[PDB]
Amino acid sequence: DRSSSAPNV
Amino acid sequence: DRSSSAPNV
Amino acid sequence: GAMGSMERASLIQKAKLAEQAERYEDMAAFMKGAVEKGEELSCEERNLLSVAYKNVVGGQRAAWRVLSSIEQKSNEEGSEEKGPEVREYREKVETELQGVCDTVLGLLDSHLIKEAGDAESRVFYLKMKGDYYRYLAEVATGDDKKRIIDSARSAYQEAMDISKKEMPPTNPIRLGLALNFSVFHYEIANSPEEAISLAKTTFDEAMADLHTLSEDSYKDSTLIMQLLRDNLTLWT
Amino acid sequence: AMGSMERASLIQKAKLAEQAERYEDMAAFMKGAVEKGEELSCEERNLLSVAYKNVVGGQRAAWRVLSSIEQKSGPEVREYREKVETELQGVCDTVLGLLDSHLIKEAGDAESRVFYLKMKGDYYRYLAEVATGDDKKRIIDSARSAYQEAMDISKKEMPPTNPIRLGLALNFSVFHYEIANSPEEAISLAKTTFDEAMADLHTLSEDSYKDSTLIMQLLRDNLTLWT
Ligand SMILES: *CC(=O)N1CC[C@@]2(CCN(S(=O)(=O)c3ccc(Br)c(F)c3)C2)C1
Ligand SMILES: *CC(=O)N1CC[C@@]2(CCN(S(=O)(=O)c3ccc(Br)c(F)c3)C2)C1
Ligand SMILES: [Cl-]
Ligand SMILES: [Cl-]
Ligand SMILES: [Mg+2]
Ligand SMILES: [Mg+2]
Ligand SMILES: [Mg+2]
Ligand SMILES: [Mg+2]
Ligand SMILES: [Mg+2]
């Protein structure tokens, strides 16, 4: 997988 | 609630 | 840029790439370029053309419906302040939607309908003409509305007449046409009786010949028949 | 046309566009709002962020699909990948342009300063994802510098469980891992961020609890992936 970055809140 | 038309195959 | 000078094969390939990238606006632009090379489209290529524009106009229709709902909720609340912004933005989205519809109808008229050989391709394109006039009808309000509805009906009826003469009752395109014409009757032309009668007849005649239907079209045709049934349940 | 619209109308239209899932429109409305020259509130910064994140997000997804096909491999896929890439770079340049010309200032609260510097880091990071030249090195340095400045402010001015501080730290850790080939720093930053945040979680206001716990979960998910 790719790393997760900050999502839309 | 809308009727269903043909979808993408 | 400048698709007129591009190889037809390259435009088709780029449409397939755009599909994989879920870039439907690009996909539609590539297929428009391919049509403008002036050769007929195969069944596969007609599918690419259809998927591309259906996804583009589909997103616009969804957005229009959201905005129209907000607009009417605002208006009926009748508050002294809110309403102009949502109206303006609904109008903007509507104008873009009409532009895509006009592009498709333009292609059908200038390149695809006249030049189609076989019945299958003729029915497909006449169905598509019906569909994009129907999408125009969804947002039409003037006296232009009546004319748009008549254009949709005329396209669908011509397609129906050919499909009945030239195509088996279980043919996917014939079925897809019949489904969409029934939706036109119900949702656009305020003719629920005709909608139900067409859908019911289409379903029964398809089911009667289902044992003859080839395995290659089985999935598509049974899906349409299920939607006929789903609509019939909704409408009755 | 945006210049002639009132600021309040642009904000309203951005909210309408959000509801319609029309993110390109939403971004254009928020760009117009920024260009009115007044500061953005927390809520308005969210609108700006969501709009451009969704636009560039779609382009990044498409670029990855095309780049994958290209690497498996006529000129078509290369050409089309280049086209999508150029559009993605255009959106990044627009955002970085707005940050530089209007949003990043010496003044205003730490939260807004950190937010905009984080965003600068993010959009240089997106440029870095597709960069290949010597421009790549410069782009990476620009991302790092933006993130580092944001980190320095956040450490001095903001609690460890603050959502923006956390979001910054998460994205900087991703930069370390995915861009700068620094897994040790990525893991160490993520681990330290998580522990320090959890240690102070009992002091965090309830209005930030959901956002902060989401970021902390992503820190944990990344840590599990990276180790
Ligand atoms: C052979 C040919 O010209 N085709 C096959 C597929 C398509 C594009 C979509 N249709 S349709 O609109 O007639 C249709 C859509 C969905 C389904 Br399940 C269906 F059976 C037909 C014709 C172009
Ligand atoms: C108050 C303020 O300026 N805000 C609140 C939301 C946002 C928009 C994007 N972030 S973020 O990138 O710092 C972030 C994203 C997701 C999550 Br769950 C989070 F906690 C922070 C700040 C602008
Ligand atoms: Cl507008
Ligand atoms: Cl291209
Ligand atoms: Mg050629
Ligand atoms: Mg009121
Ligand atoms: Mg109108
Ligand atoms: Mg003004
Ligand atoms: Mg390039």
Side-chain angles (χ1 to χ4, degrees):
Chain A
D1 294 6
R2 281 178 186 287
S3 310
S4 301
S5 65
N8 298 128
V9 35
Chain B
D1 203 75
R2 292 164 185 292
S3 306
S4 293
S5 62
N8 297 316
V9 304
Chain C
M3 286 193 199
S5 288
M6 279 175 88
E7 295 187 359
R8 191 184 181 285
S10 295
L11 294 167
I12 297 300
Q13 186 178 340
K14 288 186 180 189
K16 291 178 180 170
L17 291 172
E19 189 180 26
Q20 289 174 87
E22 302 176 51
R23 293 271 289 190
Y24 297 116
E25 195 170 297
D26 287 351
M27 180 186 188
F30 292 129
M31 286 310 301
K32 176 174 188 285
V35 168
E36 290 167 347
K37 297 301 290 179
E39 303 296 348
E40 292 184 79
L41 300 195
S42 65
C43 176
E44 177 181 33
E45 292 164 349
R46 287 185 307 245
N47 187 59
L48 295 173
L49 178 74
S50 179
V51 168
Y53 278 108
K54 181 159 176 62
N55 288 340
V56 172
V57 76
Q60 297 172 319
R61 289 167 71 205
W64 188 94
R65 289 165 185 173
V66 166
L67 293 174
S68 181
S69 178
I70 297 167
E71 181 184 10
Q72 294 178 69
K73 296 293 177 63
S74 172
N75 291 165
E76 66 86 18
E77 195 185 314
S79 62
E80 213 173 325
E81 69 279 356
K82 58 184 187 300
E85 283 77 2
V86 59
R87 181 187 176 78
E88 291 174 5
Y89 184 49
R90 188 268 301 153
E91 286 168 325
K92 180 187 163 66
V93 170
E94 186 174 301
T95 302
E96 292 186 18
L97 182 162
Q98 292 167 326
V100 169
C101 290
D102 290 346
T103 297
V104 171
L105 294 170
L107 276 185
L108 290 167
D109 191 62
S110 65
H111 286 94
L112 296 172
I113 291 172
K114 273 91 164 187
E115 301 188 48
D118 62 14
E120 194 169 68
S121 67
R122 276 182 284 124
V123 170
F124 171 74
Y125 294 131
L126 286 171
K127 174 191 164 297
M128 187 170 199
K129 187 174 180 171
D131 290 339
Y132 282 79
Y133 273 116
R134 171 158 63 81
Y135 308 148
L136 286 178
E138 284 174 348
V139 309
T141 55
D143 311 65
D144 191 2
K145 191 183 184 176
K146 192 269 184 180
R147 194 262 296 160
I148 291 168
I149 290 173
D150 290 346
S151 291
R153 180 182 290 111
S154 178
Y156 283 134
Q157 189 52 244
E158 188 177 359
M160 287 287 318
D161 291 350
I162 299 167
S163 69
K164 289 183 186 167
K165 284 161 193 172
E166 299 289 343
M167 284 159 79
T170 48
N171 177 285
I173 295 161
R174 175 171 169 177
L175 283 173
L177 164 64
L179 175 63
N180 288 7
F181 195 18
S182 74
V183 170
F184 168 80
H185 286 312
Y186 196 82
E187 297 286 354
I188 305 297
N190 209 64
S191 306
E193 294 186 359
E194 296 185 306
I196 293 163
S197 189
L198 174 57
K200 186 51 158 66
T201 298
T202 306
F203 181 95
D204 291 345
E205 290 183 351
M207 187 67 71
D209 284 52
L210 184 158
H211 65 66
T212 214
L213 186 53
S214 71
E215 194 273 355
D216 203 70
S217 69
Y218 182 70
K219 290 183 178 71
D220 287 357
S221 288
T222 54
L223 176 53
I224 300 296
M225 283 170 76
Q226 183 63 53
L227 295 174
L228 287 169
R229 180 50 56 181
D230 293 347
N231 282 348
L232 280 171
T233 300
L234 178 71
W235 299 342
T236 64
Chain D
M2 303 295 178
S4 64
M5 280 179 214
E6 299 185 1
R7 192 185 184 283
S9 295
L10 291 166
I11 296 302
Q12 186 52 66
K13 286 184 181 181
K15 292 178 178 168
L16 290 171
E18 189 179 32
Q19 288 173 91
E21 302 182 51
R22 293 271 292 189
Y23 296 116
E24 195 176 298
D25 286 348
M26 181 186 187
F29 292 130
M30 286 311 300
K31 177 172 187 287
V34 168
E35 288 167 348
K36 293 296 176 178
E38 295 193 356
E39 291 177 75
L40 272 57
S41 65
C42 179
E43 180 178 345
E44 293 165 348
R45 287 185 306 246
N46 188 58
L47 296 172
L48 179 74
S49 179
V50 168
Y52 278 109
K53 180 152 177 60
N54 289 155
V55 171
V56 75
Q59 298 171 318
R60 290 167 71 207
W63 188 94
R64 289 163 186 165
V65 164
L66 294 173
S67 182
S68 178
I69 297 167
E70 183 179 13
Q71 294 305 301
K72 294 192 207 308
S73 301
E76 291 80 359
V77 60
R78 185 179 51 67
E79 290 173 353
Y80 184 49
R81 190 267 301 147
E82 285 171 357
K83 184 197 183 200
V84 171
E85 186 173 300
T86 301
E87 192 189 295
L88 183 162
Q89 292 165 330
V91 171
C92 291
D93 290 345
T94 298
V95 171
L96 293 169
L98 277 183
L99 289 168
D100 190 62
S101 64
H102 286 95
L103 296 172
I104 296 172
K105 302 175 185 301
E106 296 281 6
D109 63 11
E111 195 163 69
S112 65
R113 278 183 284 124
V114 171
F115 171 73
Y116 293 129
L117 285 172
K118 174 188 163 299
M119 188 172 197
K120 186 175 176 176
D122 290 339
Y123 282 79
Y124 273 115
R125 172 159 61 81
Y126 306 149
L127 286 179
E129 284 176 347
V130 308
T132 55
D134 261 298
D135 57 357
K136 189 184 181 63
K137 193 268 184 179
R138 192 211 83 229
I139 289 166
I140 290 172
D141 290 347
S142 291
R144 183 195 310 291
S145 178
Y147 283 133
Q148 189 55 64
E149 189 177 359
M151 287 286 316
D152 292 350
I153 299 168
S154 69
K155 288 182 185 304
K156 283 161 179 162
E157 303 205 47
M158 286 161 80
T161 338
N162 176 286
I164 291 168
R165 174 169 172 179
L166 284 174
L168 165 65
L170 175 64
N171 287 8
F172 197 17
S173 73
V174 170
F175 168 80
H176 286 314
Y177 197 81
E178 297 286 354
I179 304 298
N181 292 124
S182 306
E184 303 89 339
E185 189 51 52
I187 294 161
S188 192
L189 173 57
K191 185 51 157 67
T192 298
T193 304
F194 181 93
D195 291 345
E196 291 183 350
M198 285 297 295
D200 213 53
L201 176 60
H202 65 295
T203 81
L204 182 67
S205 72
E206 195 51 22
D207 95 294
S208 297
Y209 180 71
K210 192 250 85 192
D211 292 345
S212 287
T213 54
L214 177 52
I215 301 298
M216 282 185 292
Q217 182 64 54
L218 295 175
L219 288 170
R220 183 191 305 257
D221 292 348
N222 282 348
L223 279 170
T224 298
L225 179 70
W226 298 341
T227 64

mmCIF file of all heavy atoms in Angstrom, chain D residues 24-51:
data_model
loop_
_atom_site.group_PDB
_atom_site.id
_atom_site.type_symbol
_atom_site.label_atom_id
_atom_site.label_comp_id
_atom_site.label_asym_id
_atom_site.label_seq_id
_atom_site.Cartn_x
_atom_site.Cartn_y
_atom_site.Cartn_z
ATOM 1 N N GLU D 24 -13.846 21.214 -9.016
ATOM 2 C CA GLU D 24 -13.190 22.216 -9.839
ATOM 3 C C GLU D 24 -13.849 23.591 -9.680
ATOM 4 O O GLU D 24 -13.165 24.598 -9.498
ATOM 5 C CB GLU D 24 -13.217 21.764 -11.297
ATOM 6 C CG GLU D 24 -12.266 22.516 -12.197
ATOM 7 C CD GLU D 24 -12.250 21.967 -13.607
ATOM 8 O OE1 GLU D 24 -11.885 20.780 -13.777
ATOM 9 O OE2 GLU D 24 -12.625 22.715 -14.537
ATOM 10 N N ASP D 25 -15.183 23.624 -9.764
ATOM 11 C CA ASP D 25 -15.943 24.840 -9.511
ATOM 12 C C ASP D 25 -15.672 25.362 -8.104
ATOM 13 O O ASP D 25 -15.410 26.549 -7.910
ATOM 14 C CB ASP D 25 -17.448 24.594 -9.666
ATOM 15 C CG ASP D 25 -17.944 24.432 -11.091
ATOM 16 O OD1 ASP D 25 -17.168 24.726 -12.027
ATOM 17 O OD2 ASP D 25 -19.107 24.004 -11.266
ATOM 18 N N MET D 26 -15.741 24.455 -7.126
ATOM 19 C CA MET D 26 -15.536 24.811 -5.731
ATOM 20 C C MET D 26 -14.176 25.484 -5.549
ATOM 21 O O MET D 26 -14.067 26.491 -4.849
ATOM 22 C CB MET D 26 -15.661 23.556 -4.864
ATOM 23 C CG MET D 26 -15.493 23.801 -3.376
ATOM 24 S SD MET D 26 -15.495 22.230 -2.467
ATOM 25 C CE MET D 26 -15.503 22.825 -0.830
ATOM 26 N N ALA D 27 -13.146 24.927 -6.198
ATOM 27 C CA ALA D 27 -11.803 25.474 -6.102
ATOM 28 C C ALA D 27 -11.737 26.871 -6.717
ATOM 29 O O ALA D 27 -11.128 27.770 -6.144
ATOM 30 C CB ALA D 27 -10.799 24.549 -6.766
ATOM 31 N N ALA D 28 -12.382 27.042 -7.876
ATOM 32 C CA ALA D 28 -12.423 28.327 -8.555
ATOM 33 C C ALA D 28 -13.120 29.412 -7.728
ATOM 34 O O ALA D 28 -12.657 30.554 -7.684
ATOM 35 C CB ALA D 28 -13.093 28.172 -9.911
ATOM 36 N N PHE D 29 -14.226 29.051 -7.064
ATOM 37 C CA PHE D 29 -14.917 29.977 -6.173
ATOM 38 C C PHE D 29 -14.039 30.393 -4.988
ATOM 39 O O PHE D 29 -14.016 31.566 -4.608
ATOM 40 C CB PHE D 29 -16.251 29.373 -5.661
ATOM 41 C CG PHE D 29 -17.314 29.218 -6.737
ATOM 42 C CD1 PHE D 29 -17.989 28.019 -6.905
ATOM 43 C CD2 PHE D 29 -17.644 30.277 -7.571
ATOM 44 C CE1 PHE D 29 -18.967 27.881 -7.896
ATOM 45 C CE2 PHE D 29 -18.618 30.135 -8.560
ATOM 46 C CZ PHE D 29 -19.274 28.934 -8.711
ATOM 47 N N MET D 30 -13.309 29.427 -4.416
ATOM 48 C CA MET D 30 -12.476 29.702 -3.257
ATOM 49 C C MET D 30 -11.259 30.528 -3.665
ATOM 50 O O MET D 30 -10.848 31.410 -2.924
ATOM 51 C CB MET D 30 -12.064 28.416 -2.547
ATOM 52 C CG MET D 30 -13.204 27.786 -1.762
ATOM 53 S SD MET D 30 -14.099 28.924 -0.666
ATOM 54 C CE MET D 30 -12.778 29.449 0.418
ATOM 55 N N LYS D 31 -10.717 30.276 -4.863
ATOM 56 C CA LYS D 31 -9.651 31.111 -5.396
ATOM 57 C C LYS D 31 -10.115 32.563 -5.517
ATOM 58 O O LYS D 31 -9.385 33.484 -5.146
ATOM 59 C CB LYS D 31 -9.172 30.573 -6.740
ATOM 60 C CG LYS D 31 -8.102 31.421 -7.413
ATOM 61 C CD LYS D 31 -7.535 30.719 -8.671
ATOM 62 C CE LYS D 31 -6.358 31.442 -9.270
ATOM 63 N NZ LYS D 31 -6.773 32.678 -9.965
ATOM 64 N N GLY D 32 -11.336 32.761 -6.026
ATOM 65 C CA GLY D 32 -11.920 34.089 -6.084
ATOM 66 C C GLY D 32 -12.070 34.733 -4.706
ATOM 67 O O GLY D 32 -11.845 35.932 -4.537
ATOM 68 N N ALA D 33 -12.461 33.925 -3.719
ATOM 69 C CA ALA D 33 -12.643 34.415 -2.363
ATOM 70 C C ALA D 33 -11.308 34.853 -1.766
ATOM 71 O O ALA D 33 -11.230 35.892 -1.113
ATOM 72 C CB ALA D 33 -13.300 33.352 -1.499
ATOM 73 N N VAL D 34 -10.258 34.059 -1.997
ATOM 74 C CA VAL D 34 -8.929 34.413 -1.524
ATOM 75 C C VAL D 34 -8.489 35.747 -2.124
ATOM 76 O O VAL D 34 -7.946 36.598 -1.420
ATOM 77 C CB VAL D 34 -7.920 33.290 -1.828
ATOM 78 C CG1 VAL D 34 -6.474 33.760 -1.616
ATOM 79 C CG2 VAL D 34 -8.224 32.052 -0.986
ATOM 80 N N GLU D 35 -8.770 35.928 -3.419
ATOM 81 C CA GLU D 35 -8.353 37.113 -4.148
ATOM 82 C C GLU D 35 -9.081 38.394 -3.744
ATOM 83 O O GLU D 35 -8.677 39.477 -4.156
ATOM 84 C CB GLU D 35 -8.502 36.851 -5.656
ATOM 85 C CG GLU D 35 -7.441 35.874 -6.148
ATOM 86 C CD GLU D 35 -7.646 35.301 -7.536
ATOM 87 O OE1 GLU D 35 -8.750 35.455 -8.104
ATOM 88 O OE2 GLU D 35 -6.691 34.679 -8.054
ATOM 89 N N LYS D 36 -10.128 38.277 -2.917
ATOM 90 C CA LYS D 36 -10.738 39.445 -2.303
ATOM 91 C C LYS D 36 -9.803 40.101 -1.289
ATOM 92 O O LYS D 36 -9.973 41.273 -0.957
ATOM 93 C CB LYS D 36 -12.083 39.082 -1.653
ATOM 94 C CG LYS D 36 -13.150 38.680 -2.669
ATOM 95 C CD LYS D 36 -13.516 39.847 -3.589
ATOM 96 C CE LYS D 36 -14.490 39.460 -4.665
ATOM 97 N NZ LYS D 36 -14.864 40.616 -5.512
ATOM 98 N N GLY D 37 -8.823 39.334 -0.799
ATOM 99 C CA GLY D 37 -7.727 39.887 -0.020
ATOM 100 C C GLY D 37 -7.929 39.900 1.493
ATOM 101 O O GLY D 37 -7.094 40.438 2.209
ATOM 102 N N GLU D 38 -9.036 39.318 1.972
ATOM 103 C CA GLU D 38 -9.278 39.191 3.401
ATOM 104 C C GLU D 38 -8.832 37.808 3.867
ATOM 105 O O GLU D 38 -8.813 36.864 3.077
ATOM 106 C CB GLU D 38 -10.763 39.418 3.726
ATOM 107 C CG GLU D 38 -11.227 40.832 3.417
ATOM 108 C CD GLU D 38 -12.577 41.223 4.000
ATOM 109 O OE1 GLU D 38 -13.239 40.363 4.625
ATOM 110 O OE2 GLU D 38 -12.966 42.401 3.837
ATOM 111 N N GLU D 39 -8.473 37.696 5.150
ATOM 112 C CA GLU D 39 -8.098 36.411 5.724
ATOM 113 C C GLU D 39 -9.245 35.411 5.612
ATOM 114 O O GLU D 39 -10.411 35.802 5.557
ATOM 115 C CB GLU D 39 -7.715 36.542 7.204
ATOM 116 C CG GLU D 39 -6.425 37.290 7.453
ATOM 117 C CD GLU D 39 -6.115 37.458 8.927
ATOM 118 O OE1 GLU D 39 -5.694 36.471 9.574
ATOM 119 O OE2 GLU D 39 -6.323 38.576 9.443
ATOM 120 N N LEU D 40 -8.894 34.121 5.584
ATOM 121 C CA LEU D 40 -9.882 33.057 5.625
ATOM 122 C C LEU D 40 -10.036 32.573 7.064
ATOM 123 O O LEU D 40 -9.050 32.431 7.784
ATOM 124 C CB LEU D 40 -9.471 31.889 4.725
ATOM 125 C CG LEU D 40 -9.918 31.951 3.253
ATOM 126 C CD1 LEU D 40 -9.446 33.192 2.555
ATOM 127 C CD2 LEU D 40 -9.420 30.735 2.510
ATOM 128 N N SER D 41 -11.286 32.311 7.460
ATOM 129 C CA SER D 41 -11.573 31.648 8.721
ATOM 130 C C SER D 41 -11.186 30.174 8.641
ATOM 131 O O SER D 41 -10.875 29.663 7.566
ATOM 132 C CB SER D 41 -13.053 31.773 9.063
ATOM 133 O OG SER D 41 -13.848 31.074 8.117
ATOM 134 N N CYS D 42 -11.242 29.495 9.789
ATOM 135 C CA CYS D 42 -11.034 28.058 9.860
ATOM 136 C C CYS D 42 -11.949 27.307 8.889
ATOM 137 O O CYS D 42 -11.509 26.433 8.146
ATOM 138 C CB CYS D 42 -11.225 27.581 11.300
ATOM 139 S SG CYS D 42 -11.029 25.796 11.525
ATOM 140 N N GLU D 43 -13.234 27.665 8.900
ATOM 141 C CA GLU D 43 -14.218 27.053 8.023
ATOM 142 C C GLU D 43 -13.897 27.280 6.545
ATOM 143 O O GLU D 43 -14.047 26.373 5.728
ATOM 144 C CB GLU D 43 -15.605 27.617 8.371
ATOM 145 C CG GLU D 43 -16.736 27.070 7.523
ATOM 146 C CD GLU D 43 -18.122 27.581 7.884
ATOM 147 O OE1 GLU D 43 -18.300 28.162 8.980
ATOM 148 O OE2 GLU D 43 -19.033 27.406 7.045
ATOM 149 N N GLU D 44 -13.479 28.505 6.204
ATOM 150 C CA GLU D 44 -13.173 28.855 4.825
ATOM 151 C C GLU D 44 -11.893 28.170 4.353
ATOM 152 O O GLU D 44 -11.802 27.737 3.206
ATOM 153 C CB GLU D 44 -13.066 30.375 4.671
ATOM 154 C CG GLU D 44 -14.397 31.072 4.869
ATOM 155 C CD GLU D 44 -14.327 32.570 5.089
ATOM 156 O OE1 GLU D 44 -13.214 33.091 5.328
ATOM 157 O OE2 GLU D 44 -15.393 33.224 5.023
ATOM 158 N N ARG D 45 -10.910 28.058 5.251
ATOM 159 C CA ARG D 45 -9.703 27.307 4.949
ATOM 160 C C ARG D 45 -10.023 25.848 4.640
ATOM 161 O O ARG D 45 -9.404 25.259 3.759
ATOM 162 C CB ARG D 45 -8.694 27.416 6.095
ATOM 163 C CG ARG D 45 -8.052 28.784 6.157
ATOM 164 C CD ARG D 45 -6.969 28.879 7.216
ATOM 165 N NE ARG D 45 -7.426 28.479 8.540
ATOM 166 C CZ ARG D 45 -7.530 29.289 9.585
ATOM 167 N NH1 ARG D 45 -7.748 30.586 9.441
ATOM 168 N NH2 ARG D 45 -7.459 28.772 10.810
ATOM 169 N N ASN D 46 -11.007 25.279 5.348
ATOM 170 C CA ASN D 46 -11.448 23.927 5.064
ATOM 171 C C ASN D 46 -12.024 23.805 3.653
ATOM 172 O O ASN D 46 -11.711 22.850 2.943
ATOM 173 C CB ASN D 46 -12.471 23.430 6.087
ATOM 174 C CG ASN D 46 -12.756 21.953 5.886
ATOM 175 O OD1 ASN D 46 -11.847 21.116 5.930
ATOM 176 N ND2 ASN D 46 -14.002 21.605 5.604
ATOM 177 N N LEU D 47 -12.860 24.773 3.252
ATOM 178 C CA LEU D 47 -13.410 24.788 1.903
ATOM 179 C C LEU D 47 -12.303 24.849 0.846
ATOM 180 O O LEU D 47 -12.337 24.101 -0.130
ATOM 181 C CB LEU D 47 -14.369 25.982 1.707
ATOM 182 C CG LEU D 47 -15.634 25.986 2.570
ATOM 183 C CD1 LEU D 47 -16.380 27.287 2.423
ATOM 184 C CD2 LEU D 47 -16.548 24.810 2.221
ATOM 185 N N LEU D 48 -11.326 25.742 1.044
ATOM 186 C CA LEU D 48 -10.202 25.871 0.128
ATOM 187 C C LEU D 48 -9.447 24.548 0.009
ATOM 188 O O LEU D 48 -9.120 24.108 -1.098
ATOM 189 C CB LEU D 48 -9.244 26.975 0.612
ATOM 190 C CG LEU D 48 -7.992 27.205 -0.243
ATOM 191 C CD1 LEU D 48 -8.314 27.904 -1.532
ATOM 192 C CD2 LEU D 48 -6.956 28.019 0.502
ATOM 193 N N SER D 49 -9.187 23.931 1.167
ATOM 194 C CA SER D 49 -8.439 22.686 1.241
ATOM 195 C C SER D 49 -9.150 21.526 0.548
ATOM 196 O O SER D 49 -8.550 20.832 -0.273
ATOM 197 C CB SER D 49 -8.151 22.330 2.698
ATOM 198 O OG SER D 49 -7.437 21.106 2.795
ATOM 199 N N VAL D 50 -10.428 21.319 0.893
ATOM 200 C CA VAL D 50 -11.213 20.235 0.326
ATOM 201 C C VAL D 50 -11.287 20.350 -1.197
ATOM 202 O O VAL D 50 -11.130 19.355 -1.902
ATOM 203 C CB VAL D 50 -12.622 20.176 0.955
ATOM 204 C CG1 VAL D 50 -13.546 19.241 0.177
ATOM 205 C CG2 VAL D 50 -12.547 19.768 2.425
ATOM 206 N N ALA D 51 -11.521 21.567 -1.695
ATOM 207 C CA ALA D 51 -11.691 21.783 -3.124
ATOM 208 C C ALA D 51 -10.444 21.356 -3.900
ATOM 209 O O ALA D 51 -10.510 20.496 -4.774
ATOM 210 C CB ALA D 51 -12.020 23.239 -3.399
#
